[PDB]
Amino acid sequence: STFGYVHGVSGPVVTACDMAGAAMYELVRVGHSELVGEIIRLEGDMATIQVYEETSGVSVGDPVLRTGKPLSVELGPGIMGAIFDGIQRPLSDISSQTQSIYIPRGVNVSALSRDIKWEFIPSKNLRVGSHITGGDIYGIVNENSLIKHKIMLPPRSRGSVTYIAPPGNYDASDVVLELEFEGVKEKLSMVQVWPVRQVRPVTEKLPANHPLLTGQRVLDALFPCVQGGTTAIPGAFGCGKTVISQSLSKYSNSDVIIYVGCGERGNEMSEVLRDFPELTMEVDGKVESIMKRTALVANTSNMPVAAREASIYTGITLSEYFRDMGYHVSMMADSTSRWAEALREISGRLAEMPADSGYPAYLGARLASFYERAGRVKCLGNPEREGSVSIVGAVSPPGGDFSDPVTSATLGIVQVFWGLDKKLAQRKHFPSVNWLISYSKYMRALDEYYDKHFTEFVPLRTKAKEILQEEEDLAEIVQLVGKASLAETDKITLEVAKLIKDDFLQQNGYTPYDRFCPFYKTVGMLSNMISFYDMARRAVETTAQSDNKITWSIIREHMGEILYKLSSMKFKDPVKDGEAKIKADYAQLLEDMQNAFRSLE
Amino acid sequence: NYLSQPRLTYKTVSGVNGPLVILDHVKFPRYAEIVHLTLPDGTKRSGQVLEVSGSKAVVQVFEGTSGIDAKKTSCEFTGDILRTPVSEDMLGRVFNGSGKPIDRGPVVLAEDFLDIMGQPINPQCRIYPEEMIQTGISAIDGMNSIARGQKIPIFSAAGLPHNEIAAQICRQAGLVKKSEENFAIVFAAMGVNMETARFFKSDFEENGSMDNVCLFLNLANDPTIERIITPRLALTTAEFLAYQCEKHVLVILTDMSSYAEALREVSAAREEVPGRRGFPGYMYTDLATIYERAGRVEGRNGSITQIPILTMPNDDITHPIPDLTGYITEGQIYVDRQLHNRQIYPPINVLPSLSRLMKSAIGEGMTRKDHADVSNQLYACYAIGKDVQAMKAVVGEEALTSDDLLYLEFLQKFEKNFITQGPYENRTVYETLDIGWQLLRIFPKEMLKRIPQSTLSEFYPRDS
Amino acid sequence: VCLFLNLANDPTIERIITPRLALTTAEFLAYQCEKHVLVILTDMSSYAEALREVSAAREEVPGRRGFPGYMYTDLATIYERAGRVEGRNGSITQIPILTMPNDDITHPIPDLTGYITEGQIYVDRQLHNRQIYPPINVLPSLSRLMKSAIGEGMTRKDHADVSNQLYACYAIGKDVQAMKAVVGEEALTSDDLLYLEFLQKFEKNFITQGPYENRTVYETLDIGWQLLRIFPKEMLKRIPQSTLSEFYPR
């Protein structure tokens, strides 16, 4: 039988009997109200259940129903536009069906609707008797205008097709494929189920190559991320985190977005769930909602602690499911510190040894196993394809102390740090990225991509980072030397560093021409700024030895029009100017500055 | 519907051990069930089933276990968990930490019965905070403004006047009266000494304001389980008044460090191992269960705003109680020992204080168009003035520029006119903003760097 | 080459047998097939972290920072599986690689490892941030078996003297650079400026190398004497007269 009975209750811990043959970390339903919990010990016919919800009013001799599964996700059509908690409860259906502002104890709405009918097309050259393997696409559901929801055979399933449905409209409970292996059948609907803590398998796991574009000049130029990459951001109040989330959501070369709240303040979660449905992007010359390619996992700080800890495992398992369709998925975790605190509470409730700063002994192993699921892959199964998951994960060091075990482990693992900074945000400098602390390690991997597609960019990035370092090195010296007595080469460095800092690194995302700065615009601007730097340096160095030498004042007096045209480059607009027009204008400034410097040489 | 069947009574006490009574042969024990004990001398006591296993139930008695025996003492199991009667008639009433009246009025007729543990608000239903709660205190309303549906703690320490500030906010708080009716206050106080409990009850009757106020008192020598129950009775009353009777509710929770003290005491009776710095491992989840019973929700005109009041040991903000509270709530207001020693009231320091939702409370149609500008310029001038005051003793005032002397004049007049207020003085947000302009007019308008020229043109000159 | 791989997603308790499988293979190859084996153990901090996680479940007595009370013995059963033996040609050399948590050499993992192993090579974040390669800071580094593997017939007669004088001048150069940060350059005597010039030339010539450069010992020794030559010979107080009068005048 699937029923055992409650022997004893003490806090969230339930102990149940007749539980013989129940398995470690299975989920159960406890009591007449069917509270969820998981099995944490076995002893004889008894089990100990860690109940997730409130055990108040549970009684001895209550039923316990065993579910044959560990913690697992329903994966199938109806994920796009969904709101889930950390254990996949559909928060927007629970509200609609209950007509209540609360979440009931023991609510049991299924994660995906078994009510809606989905428009299904088979693979058209599959036939009865075909040989089929895990990851094989056997149909498509036309879920919305953006996502073809590819129906795939589960991993660990295989055989000979005994039946496949004709085209039509089906429930998530209708069997659409049947197959046989060793004379044993399997019947399959559109929805599969997968354990959150098991990595979804792939044919091969591949080096990351192509950039993830954000549309931001800083980020995309100075500190690039690859598709399949791993990134951290400092998650703190004044720093302006929303530019990352909105750039990824609206403008990135992702196909799909997964957003995870780990344990946020009630009112902070409400702003994300307010703003995300209202965002839009333009596709084939038509405006589309962001929620056609997006799903949200949401957890306020009073949701069950097991949901707070499961939250990132639900979000990555949902991401790995769309990777397997051959899409590129971006994942955002709202703070991984709020997850590590739930991990500390659970291990504290279990009375585990307090290791480092009260965190469990496995904290670093859990974070390494999480970020290890990022990457480009060659998918399982027959239609040859590649996909990827990229992780961005915020982290919240106490008072900026990076020696914190969670922050230290995170920055020990991730390959990019986008150091958003309150001290820059207070200057109205946007985006707030600290270009002295921020870094990317993917530059040896991206080399052969830039080399092929842009070619001149790698030298330009190198000189730009040097100018932005020399202007830090000069920042003390200028206070002693009094600006005027400085070398003309170094006055050129200071005031081209000002040009880069004010007109290249700043990008006002509310202005129509700079919402999204494409990479040809981004290299075009930097090419001209560094060309002017080289020419200004050459004009001084040609004459400084004994002539009536060139000075940075002479250059500003002789070329102030060109120096204004350079500050004017950011206003060029891909909505109204063609790529060829922007290229022609930036080439014309390069002719004009050559004619101006040749009139001084 | 109704429970209908008769209550069992038992003489099967197996053991008595500190605050716990253990019974055996109990018929299908219910966890967290309420039970009534009668002692050998006919005294009556109450308890809650702390744990169950097979035929055994263990009861924490709310009163002491003294005078209980094995032979003669008997216990009646009520059949159900703790529920509160609730109504709109609880406004103007005074209760103890277990919901019994202490005001010489009758017991509450229920409009409903509710489980005090409640249920979590759905993240899909909760909507972002909006217009201001006017507390009447210029250091909060001017520079740390509170949005309807925010939760924002006051951080204090031993001997500071946080109970006087709490009583002043309770006497003065309301909606801003732009261009009370649908307002209520639920005041809950934990571990209160008798002198402080008498101060609250006396001051709210004497200054007339009781008709808006529901008051729960738990004294320092009441049973410590009533201290666990008190926040849950208070928030169960705030949830009825806000999300059914459509009121805007302000909930004041007095000394959460006295709540955490009792939470540790219950955990030790369960024989649980002490967690970090002495408190239970689950104390974040436990506080978050109180604090996140807050906010606005879609489809309802009411709201709950919270002010948790805390006491920090050694004045140290890194202790678990103020630390974990900072991860759940969205601001802090900071009570200061140096302002208290200089005899300023209220001794609130505006530099470390913050309201994170302030931008959603202030501005045109919600306070006045200049509030966002005036708050930022006052903060800047106070920060600069504190720096000049520190260097005055290093260099001597004869070294200071004329610009430094304007800031050092502002500093002294800000603390006398703006920060200092009477415990029975009530300022609207408009008196708070107008006292702000009387201080900003110390400076030439070209020094007011944070204020745009449009705002200066309308508000800098004195009017006729 | 023989490789054993346990990756970040593989089971944790395999990590506590992985180095024992590898060292058993090195012991067959060295002490039965007579080969010279180099054994590389990659991130022993992952081994120690898996060992802590296993031991925490049995509730064995904790040592410092929550590691098992026996962690010294356990690491010693791995690191003592190295060396030469009587009558057999083969040998095992071990080069375990460690990650120090928060760069702290006093943490139990680098601490109990330094108590067992015959030295350490120390890779320094402050040299890496300055774009030097390899980032090897010599001061926290050691080799114990160096003292008898060098000198006359082994390498060159100066090797034991030059090495000790380079350590002395580098330690003093660090002390002068630390003095400069308080008092500024105008306070420094010319003798302080000699050590502060040695410091700059040592990190550029002796330390910095690039990833495929393969110097002889004799190049390393003569690059040693060139930096030492900066100092007037009476300052070279680790070196006896009979070494100075033979190698300094070149």
Partner: peptide, 25 residues
């Protein structure tokens, strides 16, 4: 913490041996 555990374990063993003696009474 390591001494507050172990004392719990010794108490648990005593309660088990006590109950397992009541099975002989």
């Amino acid at each position: 913490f390591y001494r507050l555990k172990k004392i719990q374990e010794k108490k648990k063993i005593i309660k088990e041996k006590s109950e397992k003696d009541l099975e002989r009474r």
